[model samples]
Target: ATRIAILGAGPSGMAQLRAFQSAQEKGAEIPELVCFEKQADWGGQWNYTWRTGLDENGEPVHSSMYRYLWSNGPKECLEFADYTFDEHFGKPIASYPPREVLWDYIKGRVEKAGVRKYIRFNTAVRHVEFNEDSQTFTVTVQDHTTDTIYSAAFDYVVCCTGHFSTPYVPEFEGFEKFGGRILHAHDFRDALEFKDKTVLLVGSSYSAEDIGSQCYKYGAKKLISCYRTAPMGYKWPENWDERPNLVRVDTENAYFADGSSEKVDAIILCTGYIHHFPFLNDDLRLVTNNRLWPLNLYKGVVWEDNPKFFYIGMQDQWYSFNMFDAQAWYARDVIMGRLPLPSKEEMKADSMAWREKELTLVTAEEMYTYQGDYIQNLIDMTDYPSFDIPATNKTFLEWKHHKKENIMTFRDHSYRSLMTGTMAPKHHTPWIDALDDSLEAYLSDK
Candidate 1:
């Protein structure tokens, strides 16, 4: 029997486990499966941590989740096809749930599937090296519970460690001289820390937008977000301002490229994240910027350099959990010989074709449609149980429209789910007024 090693028992890793188990429940023989999760529990980024930098084991924190975080995107866009939101919650829920609610939803699927037994918690994959002679991968992992370092060989190795944890922190001229707190968005925990203080977020991307919104909602005195390319053209509040690129910072002032300066009290670098995988060797490492089409991965799952090595949930994501589900199912089929990989040259040719199309997408709509098409392609190949990609893409369109309509009040709106075709119920309280993000408070009628 072949042994399979899955790294990082996050959403992607858990999806991989469910995919294989789904096949086995249908009376198919499955390989020996072993999943390693660095964190004590699963749910990946959904698994929140109050600890900012290093964890208890001196490992870089695997989560960048912050408090008072509601789903920025509509829940309908990410609902798993095999496991509907209605099925998980046993009723319709609001389109935008808080972090705790969403985490519970992600946990519900795998818990019902009973895949937790296959995952080795508190185990971190230290290094992964492929053996050409043996045609196997030697995965080195450290068990934090026992502090044991050991290696194991597997016929197939799937890299599901997500790409969002490592922050891409950039430095300005006087970042060192800045007197106030200088931290990346990865370390940002509570928005209450910035209350009544002037906060300067040093990027205009999603992180800057969402984190800045959190600060504004939680009672920051003023909000200033600087951008390199262009500012997010949203109707911001009175105190929120968009400036040009940050030039430098001093003890109390942040100078901008437009010859203006602001009396800022805190600096939050929301630059973004990198696809950092130091454990995988040169042959196995995926080196690409955050883009829709990362090259060298055939069909976005198999490593064309070596087909036995695979990656899941490593895209410039618009789709979240369900996208990972589709990718996981496809990877499982390939490993189980239900889907045969083509020649290496053939694989590159296929990927180049997708890359050529990926370069042409200019608008956000086009980019999401392209991703939906990619997911559709994967779904057609595997028995992942397709629902509606076009409909989900439409939901994404509506989500963007809702955000544009009112970035603050968009969460109060609900949408129809494509999986169950049920319109989501509105939250009992408005998002801005609802400060308690606990699962209990969110689900309560009060």
Candidate 2:
């Protein structure tokens, strides 16, 4: 059996594992597979505590949360064969499922599928190098628990560590001198810590909106949300009409986007993250526009000349994980010899065309397309048999509406479940409670 090592146990990694399992059940020559999860548990980034600002002591502060952080996309959009959330969650229609709940579901599925045995927890991958003589890849893993470093060799490696593992902090002029707590969205967990504080939130992405809104609701005395450019559109539930203690600012100077001029108590940057593969060198440099790189995997599967590897969950489009699942399936097809490889010219031309289209929108940041519709982008990247050709009459507004409905439901359910559980907050706010209830009711009624 060929030895295969899958990195990270996030949604993408799990999907690839399931596909490989299916291939094995069909009597194919199965690879000796092993998965590495840096954390003790699964869920990758979703399981971590996200804090966006530092405390007065310069220590990073995090929100205390239990198992519910809703997904912005409908859960139905993330299903795969042999595993799906619909059976238990009713068609997987949740607009957002709590992050904790999603992680639990993934963990349970991994166990049920007997894939847990292949996982090594708290094993951090320090580096990955390819050996030409052995025609294999060598992975260096640091066991944080035992302070041991072990090396493993594999015939193939699937990179599912994802783009968001590393936090991307942009430098702004005069930021070093301005005194206040500044933090990235990746570290933000909850808004309770921002009580009575003035917060300056940066970025126009979904995270910025979510963090800014939540902080405002949580009684932040002053909340200013600044973005480099105007948001493409506001995508929120219709019932969320209350806007107090919030000010939206457009920062014309991109260099000062990180709050150099602000004397706020805290700077919460909802700025996006970048794809990270520290092991790869300049030869494998990602394509870029304004420092962003639109993920250009052919059919969202094999990279152009590097067919031995695959990129999962690396697209910026609206279809959610539909493309990710499809890519996993396609990767399996290629690995099983069921699909032929694309010519170098074909792959290059396709990636170039897609990159050019993205350049028309915004720059590439690591592996994410800074400005691209997530749904359409997924459609362009995959050849899934069950791909849905969105109705032509479905305007962007209609799509946004559908997504809004889904997200609202997810947010409500997640908040309610967490609040009612043992995870109740030590410090509470009536305004936030009211807002949560209001949003939940609005979503439920819709």
Candidate 3:
């Protein structure tokens, strides 16, 4: 009786699709649902390729995890609630798997759900506006298939679009003149390109931590990660160094705020990204500068201004796939009328409560636990198979412990899955020596 339009087909969109399908399988009536995906493929962020970086013309990589990228955390913690790793892989594999492993894993769930036919690939959402008189969302999308722009109306619209497409690149004093290769963490495709050359990372987040680790894993001669307020302070290898924020960069050397400068072969602006959604109207668009309990969202999913609008996978992301599942399942119920809406004031109050708790989160454990607790609350309200949240929290703690134990070899450690109750097998080759990093190499019999 109702129609729904979903924007983007990333993990976020996929979860919503699966959620609706799950309801449909239980004999519930599903509305006319259509998912618009810009990429030719449905796997948005998980779909990795080096071809995209400089421009938006087909070269947009959402994951940006880079080549030789492996799961930074335990696979067990991210296992889907409805789908188990054992169901996908058939057997226990390594805790930290390569990107291909994860991509295939996510694909397996959707394939099983049979929601691919509903996705319109190569479609870009241009604009979205709510028609107050009709109580419908008018969605405009460009179909690359026929090279036509079309408009459609739906009872509901969900934005699961890629969050990292637009980058936040701050310019340095000498950036215009600095001759070295300058790129954002979003554009970084491979570490082998920087082999044997000094690489300087300009941020302390994933771009610096993971990218810096891969550089060291590969044959990079040296690594330097700069920070604004605090260094990563991990037990980095001898060749890697942490410095204060960057002040400027010469053609050959990087000047830092800590009264230090060093010659680097390449510079990476691991600077981070803005929460960009150009499709929605200004009234409906979220204006948060960063993630984790952004204002305007009631439960980090529903758009407070518009009850019919929802956002998936919109957090800073301490928890990954399963967390999205929790949100999606909850969102599905709200749309199905299985879950009723509270008043606007009550919704805003709940969001503020979470935001205040987010502000109080100082430690990494506290932040993730806060997210887990929210996820637990969402799961409690949904039919999503509840897993061990407390154990998952412990897994995060252990991952941090093992990572700080050795940022390079933490993947060597394994954590048992709460979903499957199976211990993850350690990889055959240690992460540092496993230069191949191919799925076949990691999942070898010998």
The sequence of per-residue lDDT tens digits that candidate 2 reaches over residues 1-446 is 67877887877777778777766766777668889877666666555544334422232322223212345543433444345554433322233544555656666666766777788877777787777788777889877678788998987777777765356687665566556666777666667788887776777667776676677666677766665666424544332221222232223222233334334677766767666676565433344222323555665556654667777766554543445555676777676677777788887787677667655663222123222233345434334333332321122234355435653322333111111111112112222343442223323423
lDDT of 1 by residue, 391-427 (tens): 8989889888988898889899999988878998889
With a 3 Å backbone cut-off (N, CA, C), the pairs that clash in candidate 3 are 52-59
What is the C-alpha lDDT profile of model 3 across 153-263, one tens digit per residue?
A: 999988898577679999888887787799888888888899999999989887689988887877899999989888888889899999899898887888988888788
Off by over 4 Å in 1: none
TM-score winner among the candidates? 1
Instruction: Please state the error at residue 416 of candidate 2 in Å.
Output: 21
Q: Residue 293's C-alpha lDDT in candidate 1?
A: 92
For model 2, where is the 10-residue window of minimal lDDT?
Answer: 415-424
Give candidate 3 misplaced runs (Cα > 4 Å): 54-63
Better candidate number, 2 or 3, judged by lDDT: 3
RMSD of 2: 8.3
Q: CA lDDT of each candidate?
A: 0.92, 0.56, 0.86
